[PDB]
């Protein structure tokens, strides 16, 4: 970044900062990465999205993709918010 930017002094280049996904950027990516799998009707995306901190939006993908395996192990129809909390603890231990 300092070398390429040392060779690119912002002459002809679009400068769009890529931040870590914010809260709404976790709700919408949580929905995009939640429509693909099952989801209950009694879950609140607000708090479960606010309880997924860390590096970036791939941590939410770690909660979902690393939560479907707990849905398989538990042998249930859908995934509950407590399973998502367990995956939150798992990705927060991996962090």
């Amino acid at each position: 970044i300092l070398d390429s930017a040392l060779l690119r002094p912002g002459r002809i280049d679009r400068k769009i900062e890529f931040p870590p996904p914010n809260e709404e950027a976790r709700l919408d990516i949580l929905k995009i990465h939640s429509r693909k799998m099952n989801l209950t009707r009694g879950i609140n995306l607000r708090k479960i999205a606010e309880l997924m901190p860390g590096a970036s939006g791939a941590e939410v993908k770690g909660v979902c993709t690393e939560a479907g395996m707990y849905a398989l192990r538990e042998r249930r129809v859908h995934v509950t918010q407590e399973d998502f909390e367990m995956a939150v603890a798992k990705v927060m231990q991996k962090d």
Binding site: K31, R35, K36, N38, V77, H78
Partner: protein, 378 residues
């Protein structure tokens, strides 16, 4: 909608035609009228109801609460509008359409589910809207309106079959396939009963089994039952709920007509007085009788009237016109003779008729190639 008002408002069929059971249906209909904004449904079906003395009492409160919650959903819709968001407007217009399904008006719910049907960012919520039209299409008993959105929403899924979404669509396939008389393709729909569960939205699990036991018990032969249901443990689990079904399965599979005809009156009375299963009560009876007569007559070439009358437990004067009507009308086996007062058939349907099963397609194909000759030069 998915509320119990679908079933409570679905008991209007047994509320309408018979006058004996029209007491409990109006009891829980009038008691449940204060739930899910039942004003407009029972006001439309008020001709099949009591007088107007107590009717006009609650209409003034339901007509103002309807406008209150309606204008609150309108104000919430205006608060969700002019703002950055997709699922919020889908939830506002979708909730308004759900309340418009509670009142039972498919005009504002038609244009509402049309707007939120056009605001579908993904196909999953689109199929959810389709199901939201199916849950009210069951009450509206429409034919094409519920098959259009499923015919269009059927292709291009690409997201895999869920545990309750695709299974729920299969339950709907059981619904409209039970409405129609198609059986040989509907016998595959209920095979996913392992993943089914108690769905208070459309039909209970015990009502789903009670409804599929007719298409499975009648629409299937002995190898199909032994392969599908007798080998499966599902009917072995759900037979303990009601002891009658076990009698109608082991008695039919056991070929005991003396108890099957004595207990068949419960199937006759239970067969009618149903929302979607009543108008077909004539086909299940005749089809089951000819199916049992072909079952017993399959392994039997000649049959005396004594063993037949004792086996079925009915007079000979009735089976006389039975088989007399089933020779020409039923068309099950060859001609029957009474020179010795003994049912004696031949059934040469294998050796020569097995080759003669294609002569119908040969004559129809002959007329079709005559049409091919009509295409020549014009």
């Amino acid at each position: 909608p998915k509320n119990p008002d679908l079933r409570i408002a679905q008991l209007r069929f047994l509320l309408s035609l018979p006058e004996h059971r029209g007491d409990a249906a109006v009891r829980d209909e009038l008691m449940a009228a204060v739930r899910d904004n039942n004003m407009a449904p029972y006001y439309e079906a008020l001709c099949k109801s009591l007088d107007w003395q107590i009717d006009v009492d609650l209409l003034n409160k339901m007509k103002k609460a309807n406008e209150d919650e309606l204008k609150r959903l309108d104000e919430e819709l205006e608060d969700a509008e002019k703002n950055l968001g997709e699922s919020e407007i889908r939830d506002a217009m979708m909730a308004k359409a759900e309340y418009l399904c509670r009142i039972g008006d498919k005009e504002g719910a038609l244009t509402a589910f049309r707007k939120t049907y056009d605001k579908t960012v993904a196909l999953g919520h689109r199929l959810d809207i389709v199901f939201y039209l199916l849950r009210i299409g069951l009450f509206y008993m429409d034919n094409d309106l519920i098959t259009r959105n499923t015919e269009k929403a059927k292709s291009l899924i690409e997201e895999g079959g869920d545990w309750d979404r695709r299974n729920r669509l299969k339950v709907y396939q059981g619904l409209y396939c039970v409405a129609i008389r198609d059986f040989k393709q509907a016998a595959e729909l209920f095979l996913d009963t392992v993943s089914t569960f108690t769905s208070y939205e459309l039909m209970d699990y015990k009502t789903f089994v009670t409804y599929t036991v007719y298409v499975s018990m009648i629409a299937l032969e002995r190898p199909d039952l032994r392969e599908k249901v007798i080998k499966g443990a599902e009917i072995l689990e759900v037979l303990h709920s009601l002891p009658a079904v076990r009698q109608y399965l082991f008695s039919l599979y056991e070929c005991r007509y003396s108890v099957f005809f004595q207990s068949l009156a419960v199937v006759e009375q239970e067969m009618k007085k149903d929302w979607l299963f009543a108008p077909h009560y004539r086909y299940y009876v005749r089809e089951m009788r000819i199916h049992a007569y072909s079952q017993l007559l399959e392994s039997y070439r000649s049959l005396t009237l004594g063993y037949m009358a004792e086996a079925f437990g009915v007079g000979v004067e009735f089976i006389d016109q039975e088989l007399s009507r089933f020779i020409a009308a039923g068309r099950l086996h060859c001609k029957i003779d009474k020179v010795n007062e003994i049912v004696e058939t031949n059934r040469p349907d294998s050796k020569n008729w097995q080759y003669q099963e294609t002569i119908k397609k040969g004559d129809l194909l002959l007329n079709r190639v005559q049409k091919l000759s009509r295409v020549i030069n014009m």
